[PDB]
Amino acid sequence: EDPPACGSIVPRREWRALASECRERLTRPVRYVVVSHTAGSHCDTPASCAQQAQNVQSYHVRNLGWCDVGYNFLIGEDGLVYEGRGWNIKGAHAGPTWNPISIGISFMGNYMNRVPPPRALRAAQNLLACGVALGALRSNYEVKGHRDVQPTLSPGDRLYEIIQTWSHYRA
Amino acid sequence: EDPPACGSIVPRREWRALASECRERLTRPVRYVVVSHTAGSHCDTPASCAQQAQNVQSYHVRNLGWCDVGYNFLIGEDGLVYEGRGWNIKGAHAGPTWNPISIGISFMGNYMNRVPPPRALRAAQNLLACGVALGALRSNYEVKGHRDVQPTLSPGDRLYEIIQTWSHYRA
Numbered sequence: 592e593d594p595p596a597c598g599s600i601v602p603r604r605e606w607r608a609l610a611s612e613c614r615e616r617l618t619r620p621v622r623y624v625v626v627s628h629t630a631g632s633h634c635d636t637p638a639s640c641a642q643q644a645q646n647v648q649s650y651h652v653r654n655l656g657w658c659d660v661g662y663n664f665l666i667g668e669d670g671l672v673y674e675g676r677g678w679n680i681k682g683a684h685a686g687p688t689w690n691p692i693s694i695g696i697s698f699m700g701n702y703m704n705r706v707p708p709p710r711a712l713r714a715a716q717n718l719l720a721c722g723v724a725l726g727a728l729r730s731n732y733e734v735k736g737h738r739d740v741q742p743t744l745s746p747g748d749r750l751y752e753i754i755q756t757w758s759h760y761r762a
Numbered sequence: 763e764d765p766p767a768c769g770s771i772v773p774r775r776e777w778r779a780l781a782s783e784c785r786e787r788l789t790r791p792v793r794y795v796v797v798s799h800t801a802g803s804h805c806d807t808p809a810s811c812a813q814q815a816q817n818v819q820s821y822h823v824r825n826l827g828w829c830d831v832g833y834n835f836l837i838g839e840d841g842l843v844y845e846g847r848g849w850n851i852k853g854a855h856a857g858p859t860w861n862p863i864s865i866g867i868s869f870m871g872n873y874m875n876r877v878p879p880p881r882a883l884r885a886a887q888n889l890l891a892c893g894v895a896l897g898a899l900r901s902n903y904e905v906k907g908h909r910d911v912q913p914t915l916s917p918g919d920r921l922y923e924i925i926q927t928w929s930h931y932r933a
């Protein structure tokens with residue numbers, strides 16, 4: 592109910608996620624991948640990271656009135672990937688130009704003057720490979736940083752310099 | 763063989779592991795996977811689990827004189843996979859008949875009265891799919907309990923029950 596899934600992802604129900612009401616779909620295979628940071632509190636355990644994903648979703652749903660947490664996936668410093676909207680549902684991370692053509696993944700915390708531990712970066716790339724494997728991402732997939740497509744500081748000076756070293760990253 | 767490397771694994775250096783002195787290799791592709799528990803302390807965090815891996819390698823090397831932590835991989839309740847001897851190197855987990863033909867996976871903890879969390883189970887299972895995709899395991903590969911191939915309680919009643927439900931399990 593219903594998992595044989597992939598790159599070890601914590602499912603919605605596991606992090607006590609309110610149900611999603613979002614219906615719009617993404618046409619896979621998908622082209623772009625946007626990396627952002629939540630700009631929120633960071634966590635480094637599964638217990639604290641479950642709570643943080645829960646907290647981010649709540650702010651998005653109760654306060655901004657969105658159908659679900661905005662990101663397709665969330666990455667905690669505990670080294671785990673948190674299921675947001677998933678591979679199929681259009682996200683709300685990068686504005687209306689990019690939300691229907693990209694998969695937004697978000698690192699939990701502020702990474703302006705901080706860096707995510709390797710395990711988080713590992714989970715992230717693994718997450719991405721796991722995407723292609725399923726057909727959601729297209730192998731040619733390109734990684735853009737949040738600030739490359741929107742006036743924002745996200746994902747942070749420090750995380751942004753790292754993702755530039757990634758092999759699939761295009762400016 | 764196949765460029766696309768698989769899954770997330772915490773590398774030896776990251777959990778501060780003593781250099782291995784172990785040299786006997788396994789013949790790819792391995793047919794059997796044997797699941798054990800450590801019957802030791804459990805840890806739920808990246809930090810506390812790295813320590814535990816260290817404690818276990820320590821005890822195997824310093825007190826029992828093995829060339830390396832005996833298991834090929836360890837699984838923590840933090841939902842992470844810790845690297846041991848790896849895919850290509852014979853371990854010291856299940857006796858001499860079995861060590862040369864199987865892969866040893868141990869869950870860090872005593873799973874007699876406790877089941878490991880879903881995230882632990884997810885990593886263990888994902889790890890195996892990675893083995894198959896990498897070519898280190900046989901697509902048909904068979905999972906066995908430690909107690910099926912040795913007189914032992916490992917991997918613990920609770921955990922034993924669970925692995926019996928895996929589709930690759932054969933007693």
Ligand SMILES: O=C(O)CCCCCCc1ccccc1
Nearest residue numbers: 595596597724768769891892895
């Ligand atoms: O783990 C890997 O990277 C190799 C491929 C594993 C993909 C998950 C297997 C699966 C996918 C969809 C439905 C059931 C199982």
